[PDB]
Amino acid sequence: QANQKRITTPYMTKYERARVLGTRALQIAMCAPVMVELEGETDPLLIAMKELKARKIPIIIRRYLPDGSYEDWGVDELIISD
Amino acid sequence: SLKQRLKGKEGRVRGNLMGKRVDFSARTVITPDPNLSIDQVGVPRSIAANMTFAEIVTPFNIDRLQELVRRGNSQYPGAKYIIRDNGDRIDLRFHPKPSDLHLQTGYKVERHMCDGDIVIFNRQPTLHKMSMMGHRVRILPWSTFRLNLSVTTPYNADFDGDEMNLHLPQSLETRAEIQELAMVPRMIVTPQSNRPVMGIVQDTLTAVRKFTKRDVFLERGEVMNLLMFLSTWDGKVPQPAILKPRPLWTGKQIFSLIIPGHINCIRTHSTHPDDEDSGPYKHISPGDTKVVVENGELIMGILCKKSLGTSAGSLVHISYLEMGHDITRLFYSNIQTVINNWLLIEGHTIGIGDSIADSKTYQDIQNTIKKAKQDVIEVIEKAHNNELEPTPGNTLRQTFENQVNRILNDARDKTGSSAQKSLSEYNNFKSMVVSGAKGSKINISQVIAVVGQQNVEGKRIPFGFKHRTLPHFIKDDYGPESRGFVENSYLAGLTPTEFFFHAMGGREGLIDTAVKTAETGYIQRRLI
Amino acid sequence: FIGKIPIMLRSTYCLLNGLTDRDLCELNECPLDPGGYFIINGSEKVLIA
Amino acid sequence: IWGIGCNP
Amino acid sequence: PYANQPTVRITELTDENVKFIIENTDLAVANSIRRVFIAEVPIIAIDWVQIDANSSVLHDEFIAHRLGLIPLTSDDIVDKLQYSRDCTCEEFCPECSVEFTLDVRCNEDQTRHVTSRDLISNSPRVIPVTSDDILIVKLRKGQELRLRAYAKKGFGKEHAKWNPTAGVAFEYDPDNALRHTVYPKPEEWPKSEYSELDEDESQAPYDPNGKPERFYYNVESCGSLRPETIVLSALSGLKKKLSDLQTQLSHEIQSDV
Amino acid sequence: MIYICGECHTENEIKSRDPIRCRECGYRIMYKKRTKRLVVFDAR
Amino acid sequence: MNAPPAFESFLLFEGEKKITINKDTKVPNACLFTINKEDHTLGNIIKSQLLKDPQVLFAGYKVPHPLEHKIIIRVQTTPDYSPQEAFTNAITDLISELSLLEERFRVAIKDKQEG
Amino acid sequence: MIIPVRCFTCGKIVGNKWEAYLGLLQAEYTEGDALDALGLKRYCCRRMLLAHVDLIEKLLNYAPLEK
Amino acid sequence: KRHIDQLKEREYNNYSWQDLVASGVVEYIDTLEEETVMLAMTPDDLQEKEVAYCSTYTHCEIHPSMILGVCASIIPFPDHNQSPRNTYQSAMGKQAMGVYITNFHVRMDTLAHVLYYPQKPLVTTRSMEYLRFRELPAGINSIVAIASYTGYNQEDSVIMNRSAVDRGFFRSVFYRSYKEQESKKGFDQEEVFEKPTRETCQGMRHAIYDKLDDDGLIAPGVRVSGDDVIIGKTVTLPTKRDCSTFLRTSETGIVDQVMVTLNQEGYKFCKIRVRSVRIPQIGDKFASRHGQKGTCGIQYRQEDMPFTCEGITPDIIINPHAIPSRMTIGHLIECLQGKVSANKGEIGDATPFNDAVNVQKISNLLSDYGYHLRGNEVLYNGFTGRKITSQIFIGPTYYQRLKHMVDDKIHSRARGPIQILNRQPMEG
Amino acid sequence: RDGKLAKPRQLHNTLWGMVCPAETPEGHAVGLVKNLALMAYISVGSQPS
RNA sequence: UCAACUUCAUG
Ligand SMILES: CO[C@@H]1[C@H](O)[C@H](n2cnc3c(=O)nc(N)[nH]c32)O[C@H]1COP(=O)(O)OP(=O)(O)OP(=O)(O)O
Ligand SMILES: [Mg+2]
Ligand SMILES: [Zn+2]
Ligand SMILES: [Zn+2]
Ligand SMILES: [Zn+2]
């Protein structure tokens, strides 16, 4: 939905964090460009965690409300659970 | 028939679709390992060599993966297969394949399981979600899965022939999901009862109780040796509690370095006098009971299952709720390591001398038993003379049985209390019961004083023979010995009739367990 | 001849019956073996009461 | 094996 | 800041036993000397067996096990012999090993007790401590055992077959004065053989400034090495381990510089 | 190969596709007899 | 089948260093010596001799895992002293003590015999 | 099956002492006195001879496979 | 006394149990008659005149301990253990490794475990004599310390001495026998034992067929590693199909016996027995005679194990935490009685209801031999040499090696064989 | 074994001296499989004539 | 290198 009228929680849920980190890791392992400057990190999951901490993962989560509507929350917009 | 193929357990719907046999799974016996962390699990080399994880060849890992490919399936840290972009699986086990050893970005090297891999660990039955938890792999010699002892309680696992299943995630996405949703440090506190699932257990619990007593004083070398096993140590030796005449630290002073951050907790030891809180010495507590942790420092107290165990408000629970799950993982591991080395120093044992009581104690137990048997005889005589009158809601038979049971239970309790008074500070039965590591005061009492009444189906031993319990007893004997009361202790040794009656009670318990499993399983399936 | 009845070992109709331990050793049979089982298709089967 | 109120 | 000077007094010396006392030494040094007695004194024992014919009741690897556990005289040449890994020659040679042979057949009716005496060594200095005998197997008539074995130098850390000693008795503070062991009821406890206390006094008075010293050892030989030379070899081997450690440490310090 | 007899303990040589019956005793249980190649056992 | 070979307990595999020295950043003038293929025999001896030294502020040893074969010795010394020097001096002192023990044990042997 | 070489706990050779033990038992010596005469002192070594069951004699009754 | 004296002279007196029955001294009573009979457990305690409970005893038990069966009769001091623990010990004693029969060499039985050095118990029940437990024992007496040493005995596991294990302690042999029958089903289709040929036989495997002899059967004395070809059988194909038998994976044994016979049908039948010597590992399962078992947590060498003043290091260290909840006091009494018996030279009597063997009497006997009354001993820590502050309970206890071993249970799967119907990974 | 009734499995008083109280399998067959006591004998049968 | 069935063991 629009930036206004977003009713879902601003905090990123544990499941969203898990799936975002896994997806970003798989992309990084598939030669995807890395947003953050890795400090000698060669593990895709560690690089994904580092990007999540810096809020530079280029993914927007589409949360489906039970009525069928959807809200698009950017990973940057969401507050990191940890 | 087609219906039978699809119908029940072992049918397609339930036996092949809802659950199914899976690849990348390993089962073996579990043995303890105090040295491993909570999340670490110990994997034999053969299990790790069979199971594989596919890693996409990237520019940053191409050299390492090509080395692994060169090693091959034979050398352990190697690769079993190379999956090309087309999907063709070059096989590294069968023949050198020198032209096909080359790796380019996009290829998938099926490397062997290595240290640091995340694996799900499971024990059957998976009653709750803590029965499947994510563990970080450490490869150790020999053929058993090795897990930390704080993790035994969630799995309901003891190392007496138990086996555990291991499932290896095969994708980075599912590996991250497992790591975040199911890692062992993240599972410490259960949502079922808002209590920690794991706590200090077995040897470490008893040794913590002993370590945190006021008496424990540690010299310089022992202090250094124990600080060697504290991973979170800042490298600074605390100033000893007793500087002169000789520098001596205290067990509490060293345990204060284990407690992370600044954690505030107040608990009470199991042997806390109820009078102390009301009366004077509230904050002095002559027995060193109570437990006060201020600013992450154990100011006073002796730790037991109430402080370091699986209960709400414990030091473990407060650490999880305040410092986080990673620091709590370190907390568990450090407790186990340094307290297990101090236990190497102090030592622990169980012997016959623990079961033996004073001669006066044995005399008092015998006198209590004699008085109880005499009171039961008096009750039986009242009933025979028809003096007894039924209790409201009960028949004369039921009220007589209740009176006799009350007399016998009160005598049993009094003998147990005498036995427990007999116990010394050095007694090791008492040590394990006080720490909460194992045993109960009931067990101590049965060991030392009186095994107690043997009851089947909620009643004393029934008249299985015609109007008598065993052929050795006369007909219509309702006295304590006839109907099952065992006055001898386990140490003393049960007499033959007491032995048979004790066997009857044990058989009832075993039948209860065996029958229970299936009904509870059906209920759980229905609820889920 | 109407049939063949399996013979319980060390029973009265077994060949091992009434043989001293030396004779049992000559036949490669243990003196301590209790008997009480049948050899059917080469496997020892015990009737359970 | 203890009493009527305990365990068998 | 320097090592203490230890003193030794030997109380008993018999072909099977050495009872001695070491004074003015640390507990760690004493315990590690005992540890080296058990595990790090080199000895000679059979580690390669090739059984040409075994018709005995015991299977081949049972026979090999029993042969390995048989002690062999290793008094002098164990220091001369090299480890098989060190020796340049492939497999085994006179410098790295000693060859034994067993060829026994029970032709007679009476049971033949194959003993360690039947093992015949190619070098006279190593013999199976025969100079009864260890029983390898009993052979019924018509049963034969033929085998060749090679005995190599090794120490008890590899395998217990290479333990040079039977029981190392180590005691310190015979009367509990450092309170390293706290007796719940001191009187019930038997006095030590080295105890100097009167019969009335169960424990010596607590010595706050005391340190474990005056360690008492009883080293029993398995017969392969003389009990004196077990102790001498242990001291020398511990010194050699420390010297190798020092050499590697010096090399790594130089590398860091 | 050469098969040792179960009962009379006399080696008899039986060709392939030949009935397993020892000459001079008739016993029908033979044993294959130990191999010529030798296996090394570590005494451990 | 997963049983490690016995020689692994004391034999260095190719490319393994007997001693590796890593400084400890948490504290000034501290070091951590990792000895491979060694056990409590050497560790306890060295820790005790280091404790005897007055300029050694901390000395400890640990076996990180019983199944594996390694010894970690943390040594912290006072300023104007080096932990590496303390380790070398400990080793030399232990060597001297053992040599004196050998000489006196030989003399005791020769006197118990022959009189 | 046969007397073990070396006591399990300590390693003193007990394999050479079984025939002497049996002979001393035939003489008149009680089990404890025979064990003392053989020189077995620690209860670990005395367990080896005292609890040993010699099955090799029963196994030798069966005829050898090859004669 | 006349009957007992004649039975005591049983042989060369031609007096037996049947003469005892014929005299009218003993009588067989079934349950229905047991309902109508007044019994005395013991003659002296019950028949003799006292405060008169019953003066109409019609029968007397020969001995109470006979109420137990074969497996529970081996339990020493069973009246001092909790009842479920005796059931557990019955179950586990059915699983202990020993010499199962003396003719084990002749028999070719699949899955036969035989122990190297079985020992008779130092603490034994009298009824064991009639179970032939002395003749064919299962288990070894072992110096056992009940102590918490390094945490590897925690829960129910057991620390073991590696040196003792290296000297023969609980070493076993596992024999696996494989049967294969050549048979002719079709008139032109037959199975023949032969060494398969790569070209002649269509079906083959990577597995080495060289070890097969000319007849197609491995000769005894040949080491066979997992997946090698024990028996080579080829079927004529109406060129040939390979039905050769292979070793069970990870068997890793040496061939013991190869027998070639003719079955009832007249076809050639071959049985091949493989020896695998199994040394105790740190997964194998060991249990006492009192219903408490455990896997080997770790193995420490004699230098590492705690030692007494005399130099004795425990063969087995069990966690103290096992004892309290299970209340198997018979274990502690058996350690004390074993210590007394081993020092005395006798064999201890652990009959269930002796009434002449108190724990106090055993303690007083142990005091005479120079040890602590209750069996505790001052142990010295193996690693540091310092005396352990808590004196530790040590004694000779009989331990059994159960058939459950880790090598048989370890398993792993990675894209292996798959079923036809479900196309899902297989089972087993 | 499927029946969960805890009546047929329990150690009856009449089992004294004739079936071992301790020795029973554990699982679905607790108390349903039993073992003879050491001195127990089972009648072989006789003619009532 | 099949599948059904049974029984026996392990938690
Ligand atoms: C503690 O609970 C466990 C589990 O619940 C699991 N388990 C075991 N058998 C079954 C079964 O048939 N069916 C299902 N569903 N689960 C089962 O085993 C239970 C205990 O059994 P036990 O009581 O014998 O454990 P000891 O107390 O005996 O342990 P020692 O001292 O021997 O090591
Ligand atoms: Mg268990
Ligand atoms: Zn050479
Ligand atoms: Zn013949
Ligand atoms: Zn011994």
CSV table of C-alpha atoms (C1' of nucleotides) and ligand atoms in Angstrom, one decimal, chain B residues 123-125 127 156 158-160 513-514 517-518, chain I residues 85 88 92 156 291-294 322 326, chain J residues 26-27, chain K residues 10-11, ligand 1:
chain,number,residue,atom,x,y,z
B,123,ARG,CA,15.1,-36.8,19.4
B,124,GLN,CA,12.0,-38.9,19.2
B,125,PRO,CA,9.3,-38.1,20.2
B,127,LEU,CA,7.0,-33.5,22.0
B,156,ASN,CA,14.8,-35.4,27.2
B,158,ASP,CA,20.3,-39.3,28.7
B,159,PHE,CA,23.4,-41.0,27.5
B,160,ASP,CA,22.4,-44.6,28.2
B,513,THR,CA,4.3,-45.8,31.9
B,514,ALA,CA,3.8,-48.2,29.0
B,517,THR,CA,2.7,-43.4,26.1
B,518,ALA,CA,0.0,-44.3,23.5
I,85,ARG,CA,15.8,-52.0,38.5
I,88,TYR,CA,15.9,-53.7,33.9
I,92,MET,CA,20.0,-56.3,30.2
I,156,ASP,CA,24.2,-42.2,32.5
I,291,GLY,CA,19.7,-52.3,36.2
I,292,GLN,CA,21.8,-49.2,35.5
I,293,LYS,CA,23.5,-49.0,32.1
I,294,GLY,CA,25.5,-46.4,30.2
I,322,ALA,CA,23.0,-42.5,39.0
I,326,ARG,CA,17.3,-45.2,41.2
J,26,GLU,CA,9.1,-53.7,29.0
J,27,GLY,CA,7.0,-52.1,26.3
K,10,U,C1',16.4,-50.4,21.3
K,11,G,C1',14.5,-45.4,23.4
L,1,LIG,C1,12.2,-40.4,30.2
L,1,LIG,O1,11.2,-40.6,29.2
L,1,LIG,C2,11.6,-41.3,28.1
L,1,LIG,C3,10.9,-40.9,26.8
L,1,LIG,O2,9.6,-40.6,27.1
L,1,LIG,C4,11.3,-42.1,25.8
L,1,LIG,N1,10.6,-43.4,25.4
L,1,LIG,C5,11.1,-44.5,25.9
L,1,LIG,N2,10.4,-45.6,25.6
L,1,LIG,C6,9.3,-45.2,24.9
L,1,LIG,C7,8.1,-45.8,24.3
L,1,LIG,O3,7.9,-47.0,24.4
L,1,LIG,N3,7.3,-45.0,23.6
L,1,LIG,C8,7.5,-43.6,23.5
L,1,LIG,N4,6.6,-42.9,22.8
L,1,LIG,N5,8.6,-43.0,24.1
L,1,LIG,C9,9.5,-43.7,24.8
L,1,LIG,O4,11.7,-42.9,26.7
L,1,LIG,C10,11.1,-42.5,28.2
L,1,LIG,C11,11.7,-43.1,29.5
L,1,LIG,O5,11.8,-44.5,29.8
L,1,LIG,P1,12.7,-45.2,31.0
L,1,LIG,O6,11.8,-45.0,32.2
L,1,LIG,O7,13.0,-46.8,30.8
L,1,LIG,O8,14.1,-44.3,31.3
L,1,LIG,P2,15.1,-44.7,32.6
L,1,LIG,O9,14.4,-44.1,33.8
L,1,LIG,O10,14.7,-46.1,32.6
L,1,LIG,O11,16.8,-44.4,32.4
L,1,LIG,P3,18.3,-45.1,32.8
L,1,LIG,O12,18.8,-45.1,34.3
L,1,LIG,O13,18.4,-46.6,32.4
L,1,LIG,O14,19.4,-44.6,32.0
